[PDB]
Amino acid sequence: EMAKPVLPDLSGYTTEAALKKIARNKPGKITVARMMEETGLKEFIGGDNKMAEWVVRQKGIPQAIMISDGYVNLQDLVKKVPKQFLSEVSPGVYVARLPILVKETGIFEIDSKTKELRLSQEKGSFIVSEGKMLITNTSVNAWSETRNGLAAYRTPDEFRPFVLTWGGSQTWIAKTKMASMGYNQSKSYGVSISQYTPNTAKVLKRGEPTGWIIDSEFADMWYGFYCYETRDFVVKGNTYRDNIVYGIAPHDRSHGLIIAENDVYGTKKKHGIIISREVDNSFIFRNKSHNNKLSGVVLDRNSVGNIVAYNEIYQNHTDGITLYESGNNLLWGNRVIANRRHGIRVRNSVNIKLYENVAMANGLMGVYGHIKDLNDTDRDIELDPFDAQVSLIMVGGELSSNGSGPLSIDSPLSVELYRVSMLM
Numbered sequence: 001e002m003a004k005p006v007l008p009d010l011s012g013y014t015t016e017a018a019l020k021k022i023a024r025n026k027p028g029k030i031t032v033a034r035m036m037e038e039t040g041l042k043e044f045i046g047g048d049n050k051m052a053e054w055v056v057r058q059k060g061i062p063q064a065i066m067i068s069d070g071y072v073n074l075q076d077l078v079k080k081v082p083k084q085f086l087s088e089v090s091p092g093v094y095v096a097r098l099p100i101l102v103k104e105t106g107i108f109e110i111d112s113k114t115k116e117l118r119l120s121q122e123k124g125s126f127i128v129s130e131g132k133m134l135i136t137n138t139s140v141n142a143w144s145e146t147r148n149g150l151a152a153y154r155t156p157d158e159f160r161p162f163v164l165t166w167g168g169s170q171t172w173i174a175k176t177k178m179a180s181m182g183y184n185q186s187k188s189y190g191v192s193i194s195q196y197t198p199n200t201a202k203v204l205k206r207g208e209p210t211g212w213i214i215d216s217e218f219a220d221m222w223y224g225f226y227c228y229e230t231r232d233f234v235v236k237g238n239t240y241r242d243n244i245v246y247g248i249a250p251h252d253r254s255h256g257l258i259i260a261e262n263d264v265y266g267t268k269k270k271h272g273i274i275i276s277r278e279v280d281n282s283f284i285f286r287n288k289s290h291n292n293k294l295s296g297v298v299l300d301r302n303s304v305g306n307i308v309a310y311n312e313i314y315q316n317h318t319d320g321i322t323l324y325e326s327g328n329n330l331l332w333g334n335r336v337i338a339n340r341r342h343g344i345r346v347r348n349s350v351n352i353k354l355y356e357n358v359a360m361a362n363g364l365m366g367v368y369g370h371i372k373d374l375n376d377t378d379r380d381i382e383l384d385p386f387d388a389q390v391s392l393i394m395v396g397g398e399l400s401s402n403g404s405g406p407l408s409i410d411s412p413l414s415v416e417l418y419r420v421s422m423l424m
Contacts, residue, residue, distance in 0.1 A: 001395070001418075002355070005307050005332050007285050008258050013214050013236050015136055015174040022107050022132050028070030030080045032098070035062040040101050040130045040166060043200055044187035057124030057159075058098070065096070067131075068103035074110045074117060095120060095143065102129035104168065110135045118143035119161035121151040126188070130166045130206075135173045142180040153220050153244055156184035160222070164188065167195040167229075168206030173213045182222030189249075190221035195229035213238060223249045224264070232256040242266040247292065250275045250282070257282035267292040272316065276300035277384065285309040295319040296339065299326040301384045307332065314338050319345045320362065325374075325386045327351050333397070337361055342368040343402065350413060352392040359399050359406075366399035369409035389413045394420050 035041045036051060041064065045054070054062040065081055077100075078088055085098045092115030102108040108129065110117060116139040119125040127133075127140075142151040142161040151160045162182045165171050171193065182190025193209050195201055208231040215237040218224045224240040224247045227233060233254070240247035240262060247264035249271075250257055257279065264272040264287060272289035273296070275282060280303060289296035289311060296313035299306060302325060309332040313320040320336035323329065323346045333356040336343040343359030346352050346369040359366035371388040375381065391413040399406035400423040407422075409415050 005309055005330065007307070007309060008260075008283055010236055010258075010260055013212055013234055015215065018134060018172040018174045018212065018214070019136060021172055022071065022109060022134050024071045024107075024109075026070040028072045028106055029068050030072055030077060031066045031068070032063055032081060032085065033066055035064045035099070035101075038064070038066070038101060038103070039200070039204075040103065040128050041099075043166065043196060044164065053159075054124055057122065064099045064101045066101045066103055067106035067108050069105050071107040071109070073108070074114050092116070094118065095145070096125045097123035099124065099126045099128065102127075102131040102133050104130045106131040108133045110138050110140070112137035114138045116141060120145055121160060122146060124159065126161045127163045128166070129164075129171060130169050132169070133165070133171050135176050137175045139177045141178060150180040150220065152180055153222070159183055159185075162188045162190050162192065162222075164192045164194065165209055165211070166206070167201060167204065167209055169193075169209045169211075171209070171211035173211075173216055175214075176216045177219075178216070178221070179219040180221070184222065189223035189226040191218070191225050192223075193227040193230045193233060212236070217241070218243065220244070225249060226251060227254050227257075228252045230254040230257070232258070234258045235262060236260045238262045240264040240267075240272070242268065245269050246274055247272040247289070249273070250279045251277055253278045253280075255280045255282060259284045260286055262287045264289045265291045267294075270294045271298045272296050274298040274300060275303045275306070277303065279303040279306070281305045283307050283309075285311065288312040288314075290314045290316060292316045295322045296336075297321045298324065299329060300324045302326060304328045306330070309333055311335070312337075316340065319343070320359070321345070323347065323349045323352060325349060325384070329353070330355070331357055333357060335360075339363065342366075343399075344368070346370075346390060346392060347372055348374070348386050348388055348390060350387070350389050350391040354392060354394045355396060357397040359397075359402065361401040362403065364402065364404045365406070365408050366402040367394070367407040367409070369412060369415070371411055391415065394418070396420060398423070
């Protein structure tokens with residue numbers, strides 16, 4: 001019998017507040033130099049021996065547009081960078097034919113002056129930032145010069161331009177549209193916020209990256225959003241639609257995240273929203289997650305101490321919410337409606353608290369709890385251990401009109417139920 005959760009205040013996460021976030025007074029230095037001189041690029045590309053695909057895209061030794069030692073905007077880049085590498089094809093509309101690296105001391109901005117920054121698929125363009133970067137009231141899209149359109153998704157391994165930020169960086173995106181980014185390659189999922197690989201991290205010690213993404217739209221992305229060892233990142237007021245694998249997908253010891261008031265739908269292969277592998281102490285609230293190929297919302301691989309609250313979770317093709325091996329979480333007052341399978345499913349998770357959830361008209365159970373032996377499976381039990389136990393407490397809310405019944409919990413360690421409505 002606890003009190004309603006205290007959810008983080010979202011009032012200060014606005015475009016106006018984001019504009020006031022970078023230092024524009026000290027102009028920066030613009031260089032077109034070699035990719036493989038830079039840690040920001042080697043870190044995910046690999047050694048000199050991995051440079052060939054880039055040599056092919058660029059038809060020469062691989063280069064990048066590099067920003068450092070101060071502030072640079074897109075309009076600045078256009079003037080100082082050769083037209084072959086960054087062209088204005090119509091007013092406000094640019095095509096980058098090289099990648100852009102914001103170095104550690106760089107500060108990079110795109111604003112409403114830019115109608116569209118097109119990143120060339122053929123030429124191998126992408127955006128990496130180790131510094132400060134702000135993108136507002138504009139469009140950054142993965143662009144196919146061959147098709148003269150968006151680099152629309154076709155196959156997992158086909159390169160598409162992406163955005164990636166490294167440890168010690170800070171990023172703010174607001175009122176921006178991005179489409180067709182990312183593919184099945186490390187750090188290249190689409191929009192990725194990431195700490196350095198552990199080897200590079202024990203050296204640089206740059207500390208975890210952070211930032212906001214607000215009131216923006218992301219479409220046809222491999223992952224709408226991805227992060228790795230990321231702190232207090234904010235994702236609010238966005239639309240993630242028709243993305244490929246995942247809508248919003250925090251990973252790997254990220255924490256303090258705020259994922260709120262997003263509308264996530266139409267995910268083609270998997271989940272609307274997933275936090276996987278020790279994504280702890282985060283907040284998932286007031287989102288709509290619907291019509292996704294698998295679950296509406298997933299907590300995976302020992303992702304603990306989270307609050308999932310007041311989300312509208314409906315018409316997903318499997319579960320509303322699935323908890324996989326992720327104990328000690330609170331689900332408060334979610335409305336989980338008309339998902340094809342279960343409303344809320346809990347596998348191998350203990351101390352799950354279900355308070356005031358409405359689970360209605362799902363195809364199977366309203367709430368389904370079970371255990372499963374994961375030893376003879378593809379699971380790396382060293383990296384991701386598990387315990388075949390399930391336990392939960394349910395208080396209030398309502399379970400009704402579900403296809404297979406209100407609840408089923410098989411072989412529970414313990415289940416307590418208090419004043420849950422289950423209508424006949």
